[PDB]
Symmetry: none
Subunit: 321 residues, 2 copies
């Protein structure tokens, strides 16, 4: 067959590079012909991903979870083994999983997948098996651009983060609440029912777990950096969950404003965090999904969100080491 770099409305451009790059089709199209071209075009697709940081594959016959898994499987990358510290995921087939994100009428803030985890995914794929009835887009934005704008806007603020970093406080109940923006419990996060076994995996994950009265838990993480360095492209990125925590970690157990602070305890300037929230919006590209689309996101360069939505909707994913 073949692969074709195609233009779309939403995409943006940076130094003559489309974001995201879009690949579409030009023996009639088949699912085994596609996975076959994926292997045949490995170099081309590694570079395109390197140049753009994400590529949406639209038009190909990926019509099921198993189908998406063949495409994920065809890509070669090794799966990232789960260790705990993320919403309750449900295995579907092979390297592909699902997870009932926060309530459908909410906004999922921008973040890097498992950003506060030691072994975070280098890459990830998103796949739509069920088109959203309304809304429910997976807006994406280039982390390095957000860095070039933050350093430009608030140069002193970045400097404090580069020296002080951030601290995160995330109170977790014993069970999971499907109502909160971040409703995972401690037994679910750490895949443990026992406390010792838990507080142990807690230290291994680099967290300060301290059991709460009502069987809950209050974890503390950091100081940790906010500006990491993607070596493959020699550039720093906004690899932190500042906006996610400050505006998103909001429920009966956590205060948004207290969710995250400077690495040395000093509170963050509200007008600065929300200014960052505004930078993410402006630079983000939210391509409306379609049944069959496959988006390849490099986790070193991209943060992902989720617009609110009205069901039905089914987006599947795959995490790479």
């Amino acid at each position: 067959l073949l692969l074709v770099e195609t233009p779309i409305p939403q995409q943006k451009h940076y130094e003559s590079k489309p974001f995201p790059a879009v690949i579409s089709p030009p023996p009639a199209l088949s699912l085994p012909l596609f996975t076959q071209t994926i292997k045949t075009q490995k170099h081309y697709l590694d570079s395109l991903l390197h140049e753009s940081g994400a590529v949406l594959f639209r038009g190909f016959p990926v019509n099921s979870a198993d189908d998406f898994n063949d495409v994920v499987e065809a890509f070669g990358f090794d799966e990232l083994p789960y260790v705990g510290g993320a919403a309750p995921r449900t295995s579907v087939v092979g390297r592909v999983f699902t997870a009932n994100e926060s309530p459908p009428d909410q906004k999922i803030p921008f973040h890097h997948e498992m950003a506060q985890v030691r072994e975070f995914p280098s890459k990830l794929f998103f796949y739509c098996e069920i088109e959203p009835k309304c809304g429910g887009e997976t807006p994406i934005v280039l982390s390095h651009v957000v860095y070039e704008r933050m350093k430009d806007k608030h140069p002193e603020f970045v400097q404090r983060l580069e020296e002080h970093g951030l601290l995160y406080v995330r109170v977790l109940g014993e069970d999971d609440d499907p109502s909160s923006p971040i409703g995972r419990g401690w037994k679910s996060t750490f895949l443990t029912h026992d406390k010792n076994l838990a507080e142990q995996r807690a230290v291994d994950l680099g967290m300060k777990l301290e059991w709460t009265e009502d069987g809950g838990a209050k974890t503390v993480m950091g100081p940790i950096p906010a500006i990491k360095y993607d070596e493959s492209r020699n550039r720093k990125v906004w690899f932190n969950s500042m906006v996610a925590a400050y505006t998103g970690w909001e429920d009966k157990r956590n205060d948004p404003r207290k969710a995250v602070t400077f690495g040395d305890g000093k509170p963050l300037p509200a007008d600065i965090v929300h200014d960052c929230l505004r930078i993410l919006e402006e630079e983000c590209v939210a391509v409306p999904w379609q049944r069959g689309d496959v988006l390849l996101i490099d986790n070193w360069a991209v943060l992902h969100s989720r617009r609110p939505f009205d069901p039905p909707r089914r987006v599947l994913a795959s995490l790479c080491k």
Copy 2:
């Protein structure tokens, strides 16, 4: 090119009234001509042998298909799509195929009838082994009408009080969801709502009284409902309920199984008799070891199923019929 569906015997099968349980079909050894067993030939033979497969499934309660090119979830969906049963109106792997949210391997799943307390339960069910368990993992099955007949013969009075009073099912669920619980789902993720009024309205649509505990939780009561139904296709009574199941497997921090199921009038069931029912179920069951490629078809009106503990890997898919 044609294919022979050959009835075959296996060590684990039983026989009642001369009929095998479960009936087992496989493709012959030396056929004339010799067919190149394929998945597309199998599904065509299933469509062509509809009547024969209706009689076998009709008289045996379940039919295990052994020795067929069912090599992936895609192949399994093609089989289910050849039998012609309507799909049960609504995770999803492909088409009508899906993975069943289960408990840890070391645990044993109690015997039951699929969706036994849901107005529109599956009439028929399919199980498929894509990956045979390293150890155990079998999907034991048992004939519901046999359990009924033996219980009535051993405990006539108790059976008489079962049909007359029925059963009461109690569940004390939290607001949130405990991951480590066989019945961990709380009222939120149960009735898809945060609002207490709507939630209780929905539980009521499901024929159930919903109580609001002061601890932010909820207590639900179902019944009285029969513990014994009548298979019309086979003109016989079936032990269609979840008594033994709930009495032994409905436990966690908020729930005690001993009081999870009682007589429809609130009177507790005799522990000795429930365990005695557990005994009959275990004796009459058939636990055929799973071989990759197998697809088991169960008539949900005549058969209760459960699971054995196992050591992974193990992968089984399923499909439900209206």
